[PDB]
Amino acid sequence: RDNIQGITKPAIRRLARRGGVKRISGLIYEETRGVLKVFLENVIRDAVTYTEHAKRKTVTAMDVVYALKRQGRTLYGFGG
Amino acid sequence: RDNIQGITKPAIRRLARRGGVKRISGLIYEETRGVLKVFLENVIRDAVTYTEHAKRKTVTAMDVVYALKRQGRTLYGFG
Amino acid sequence: DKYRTITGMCNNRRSPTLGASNRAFVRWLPAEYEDGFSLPYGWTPGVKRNGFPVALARAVSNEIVRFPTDQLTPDQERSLMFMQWGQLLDHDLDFTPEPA
Amino acid sequence: KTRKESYAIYVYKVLKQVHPDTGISSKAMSIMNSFVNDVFERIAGEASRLAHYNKRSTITSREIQTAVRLLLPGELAKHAVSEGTKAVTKYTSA
Amino acid sequence: KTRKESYAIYVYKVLKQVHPDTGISSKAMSIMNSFVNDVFERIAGEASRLAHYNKRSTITSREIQTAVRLLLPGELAKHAVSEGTKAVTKYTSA
Amino acid sequence: RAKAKTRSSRAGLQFPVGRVHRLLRKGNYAERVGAGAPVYLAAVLEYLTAEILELAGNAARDNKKTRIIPRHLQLAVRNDEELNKLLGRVTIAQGGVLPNIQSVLLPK
Amino acid sequence: AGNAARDNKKTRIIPRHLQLAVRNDEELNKLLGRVTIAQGGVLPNIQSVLLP
Amino acid sequence: HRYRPGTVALREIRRYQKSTELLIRKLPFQRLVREIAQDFKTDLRFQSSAVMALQEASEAYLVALFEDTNLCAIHAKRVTIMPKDIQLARRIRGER
Amino acid sequence: PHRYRPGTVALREIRRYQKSTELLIRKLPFQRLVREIAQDFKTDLRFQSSAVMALQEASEAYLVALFEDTNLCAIHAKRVTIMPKDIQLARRIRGERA
Amino acid sequence: GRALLPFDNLHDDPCLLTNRSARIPCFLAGDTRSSEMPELTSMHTLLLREHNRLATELKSLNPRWDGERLYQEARKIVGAMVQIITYRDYLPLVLGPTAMRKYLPTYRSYNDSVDPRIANVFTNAFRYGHTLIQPFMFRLDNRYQPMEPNPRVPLSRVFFASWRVVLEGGIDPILRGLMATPAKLNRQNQIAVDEIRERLFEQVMRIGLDLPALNMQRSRDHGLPGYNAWRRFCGLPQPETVGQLGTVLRNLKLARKLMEQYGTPNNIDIWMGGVSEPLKRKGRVGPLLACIIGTQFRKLRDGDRFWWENEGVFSMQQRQALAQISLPRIICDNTGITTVSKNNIFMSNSYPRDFVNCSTLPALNLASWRE
DNA sequence: TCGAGAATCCCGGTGCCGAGGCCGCTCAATTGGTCGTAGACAGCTCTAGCACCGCTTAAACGCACGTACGCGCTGTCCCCCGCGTTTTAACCGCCAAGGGGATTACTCCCTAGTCTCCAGGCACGTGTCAGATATATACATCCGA
DNA sequence: TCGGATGTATATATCTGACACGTGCCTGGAGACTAGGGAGTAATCCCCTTGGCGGTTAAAACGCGGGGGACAGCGCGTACGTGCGTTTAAGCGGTGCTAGAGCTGTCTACGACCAATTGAGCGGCCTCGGCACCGGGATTCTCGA
Ligand code: HEM
């Protein structure tokens, strides 16, 4: 159940390359994993709250979109 | 009217001291004046729009409070 | 410098004569001539432009511009003040004299 | 003249409940009134959004509870929920 | 099957007005639908707040105009205002 | 009864005035909604849509394509100061990023 | 706020005490994160590198 | 034959700034999302669109954070990004 | 004669101005600046005293927070002095001049 | 009882040649072309009347002022008026919202590093208005009804006919006809009317002229580059074959005709390519003409040190007073017409749906000119 | 370490103005029924989320070099700080006008609310042509001799 | 600093699935008419904003001496980038099942809506004590020996 290691070092390196980073230190990967886990925890907690209020058992895409819009991270393309 | 120079160098030094700054380069006073001018221009433009919508000629404190709140800068103490 | 000069002189400090009247136009692209310096295209018969003959302007107007007048379509969102103000503004901006 | 309602007497009642020997100035009371209005607006707006998402025409205690859980951070939210729930019980019995 | 309303045919009509020979995919249409909904909600919320501030109970074209002035940045706003006025006048003539 | 003509046709628009009026009435914004508010909102929305679609179509044409994809919408939005300010806190799915590299990292 | 006022040997609550109460509490600071309290001042905090 | 250090890095920067695809494998991310959601509710289901939206949001967030981190690193007259740059960017942004 | 080493009076001022709650800008110059700024948007505008007071409070809070971020940026680059590039970096990361 | 333009003396006056019996020579103004048609002369006379009225009201406002001071002040007022009317009403209706926003963004300040000289291509890229010319001149009475005699006159008989201004009811019917007549829509199969193509200056000249052919010939004379060079200069894709040209023009017959007359898109004249393109949305020019015109007017605005919005040229109250001017106010204030169009005068062309009495719209408040 | 000198802190008077408590009203909040629809159940369909398997094969993972960059470590110099003197205008208190926010009151247009009727806009079905996918080729660039 | 290896953009066929039309249906928008309350003009009213004047003095300006940080240059060594070979699950199809999302129907109880009554809260009015200045001494920290 240690799936946080599924975000491999090459994936973090690709994400850094898209951001314009040329050289990456060796301790960046654990910090990035922690940051991603924090972000995902917040968003998923809000989405699950939205799902539970509707008395549903599946987390729909609209719940995720509303959860993101709550944090100020509006997302276009999924839902309406 | 060149009133931006009314925000003097010692006033900027005091504002930096409250912010925890120990040493200050001599080139940040013009930069701080520019930053303050931009911020004030935005807020005052919004406040004057709110005033003009109400067909008034006096800018009230509520107009300033609303103009700040709509920029994500809620201010408590003026209604 | 409280008012404009009639000739528009000394409007720009760097180049006072720039922007005034009775001066050369600005060329946004280098000019092309059939001789390279001052000869207009179509001056000398038989001179091909980029491997193609130079069309007669009257012929182009005859084939392409010409259209029967009886199917004129009026503009549903403009008035003749549009054309008049365009002409007046143009007469403000530029005027290219030619020898009499 | 005219009438200007505010949350001043209720804030003073709560303050007397908490600190019976402590007073409060006018600027601090203005700040507290602004705080109460701001939180009311936030919770009510979130509840309205929740009701609109599920295609409901009514704001109920469920919407208010979900809005409180979404807005208030951390253990704060939990405690608030308890308080609210207790009220809606004591109100229903009486 | 329940009908799902969207701003798809209108966006396609505008696209055919601007680029008569250019098509659009499904993800791009979803993005444009979300954009239209977002801007509608922003402007309508600002207009509602403006109506509430001045103790009015009607959303008029002046509230919409002021909301467009407040929300849209710089030159955009100006052009938008013009377009809006250009419509209402025409709508009044007919 | 005369032949019904849509309100958006009288205003010379493409976006629906009637649907916008219904959304304003049903959306819990104010107790009453004027007759000219839907026309103004429809005109503003149509203007913004036309602007962003024109920019996206130009971006697609510069790429020698025919169909608009989210990449073209992102390129249109991020290359325009006003539109970038309007959509500063908005993520476009499958949009990518604007290509830039800091001058410090380039070889000298 | 009343605790902050008492620690200051004062009877009345002023905006400084409200600011001290809000900023020194994690949950309340996160709730009022983008809020300015008039006449509240700031929290005493100097970076350790600046100290002699 | 061998390229100098920093050349393939620039080539990769140019390559991944032109594409629009997702740079994280989908199955590990889905497993991570399910594991995280296990701590809030038990026996939860996810639409595929929900996981895709979460992935898009997370990737956009991380790319923007890395841009800010690169700016912070360049400020200190450096070319490599260290965890201190990430911490400074997050603290200035207001996240910590 | 007596003399303090550089940085002693600076730290004393830091301790003094982080304990007070007053306003650090003179009121009349700020009021004149606000009126001159508002002159562009509309002519013959009147201001309540509370409006100017609110503007001053908001401006001072904004500047103090910006200077805190600027100090962090300066300390990051192993410095004690505060330079305009630190202000620019803080405003870029905050999302203002980005 | 209203002023007219001063007369001019010339060795060979075409105004007299148009009609010997009437014997009215050409007028005199700041330009030598001010008498080609009665409409241009009417606009010139209106501007002259406005300047005279402004000078009179400034003298009544400030009696100590000298004549030179009054002249200079009214000159500044009229210049700012022309700039405001143009850049606020005319250019948006030409370029359209997108091109106007792209090429003429918000004004910032004067910029001396900008060249305000008129480009060579502009003199050929601003002739798009030759496609908006109606083949008739319309005059209307006080009720906006066809004025007798001759309610509509062929355009071939109004060229240089200055006698039609002095002896045919003045400039009021001409302005009334201009305000309440739709223009001509430029279509890819209807470029320009035959009145200006086969009967231009018919009476004065031995033979009629061809305005489009004159345009292409003058483009050749000035040595301007071809259509593709300007397409590349503005940043638009450059067609090479028949299919690419048809894609660019959104028309196949026109592309075929252009290729059969020129042989390559590199050789098409700038006027032909400019007016053969499909018009922008809510604009009256294609992308290339929009690019050229917007660039030229942006340079003119940003390089002018006496711009009406520049700091120090006008006082703040003077700016607020000037921002409220309008063409209909001037039209119904400087002559006898009472009913004028509303909002954008360049857009209202239907009587009486979009007309007002101009007793409602405010005038120009000169009270800020006290010294 | 130790003493002289600023600087800040901690106590005792002395007013004074703002916070807290008391009346008088009036305008919402409460109490007592009616009514109609929104929401709470149950059934029932059928969509889509979960699970499982087999196979390429592209990705990830170790590992070995080497070089370029992060990081201390001097050294200079110049720029910012601390302090004293002179100059300026902020601040406080008091007067005098008047613009213009707030209340009344009094209609009038304008919007909600109800039927009738259709067309506009959905869902569903179909086909063809952009575009993603191979494949060889031609440049463009980088590292090194 | 001219020639070699590698990477990437380009032009030419194939195929497919997704986008752009076509058609049928139904329900949401348009056309009428009526009723009433929101808001647009007017006419007072007083309040609070602006403008002015004079004196005291606190803070902004300016100048100077010096020291302590900012910035540049110089090793050094280590850690990160680049290849290369091996392992490993990711992605893609296909099959099968069932949970639960979504729609339909019925009915009931809960909230809106009136009318009548009254007391809770707001505005105006006093009044006294908590706090803001005053002075002084006490204690502390700093920096040159
Ligand atoms: C409506 C009747 C008009 C007539 C009869 C007319 C006539 C003419 C003629 C004969 C020329 C000289 C031809 C040449 O050698 O280029 C000319 C020049 C020109 N006209 Fe017009 N014109 C009219 C309207 C307009 C309008 C509406 C515009 C612009 C909106 C315009 C813009 C120009 C320009 C730019 C030139 C070139 C000036 C120069 O190069 O000196 N004209 N006009």
Author numbering:
A (entry chain F): 23 to 102
B (entry chain B): 23 to 101
C (entry chain K): 5 to 104
D (entry chain H), E (entry chain D): 28 to 121
F (entry chain C): 11 to 118
G (entry chain G): 66 to 117
H (entry chain E): 39 to 134
I (entry chain A): 38 to 135
Sentences from the paper on this structure:
To further determine the role of disulfide-stabilized dimers for the ability of MPO to evict nucleosomes, we chemically reduced the single disulfide bridge between monomers in native MPO dimers, which efficiently dissociated the particles into stable MPO monomers that were still able to bind to nucleosomes. In cryo-EM, we observed nucleosomes bound by either one or two MPO monomers or by one MPO monomer and one MPO dimer through the same acidic patch interface as in the non-reduced MPO. We used the reduced, monomeric MPO in our GATC cleavage assay. Notably, under conditions in which non-reduced, dimeric MPO efficiently allowed DpnII cleavage of nucleosomal DNA, reduced monomeric MPO did not promote cleavage. Only at a 16-fold excess of reduced MPO did we observe faint bands corresponding to the cleavage product. This is a further indication that dimers are required for the ability of MPO to displace nucleosomal DNA and disassemble the nucleosome.
Here we show how myeloperoxidase (MPO), a highly expressed neutrophil protein, disassembles nucleosomes, thereby facilitating NET formation, yet also binds stably to NETs extracellularly. We describe how the oligomeric status of MPO governs both outcomes. MPO dimers interact with nucleosomal DNA using one protomer and concurrently dock into the nucleosome acidic patch with the other protomer. On the other hand, MPO monomers stably interact with the nucleosome acidic patch without making concomitant DNA contacts, explaining how monomeric MPO binds to and licences NETs to confer hypohalous acid production in the extracellular space.
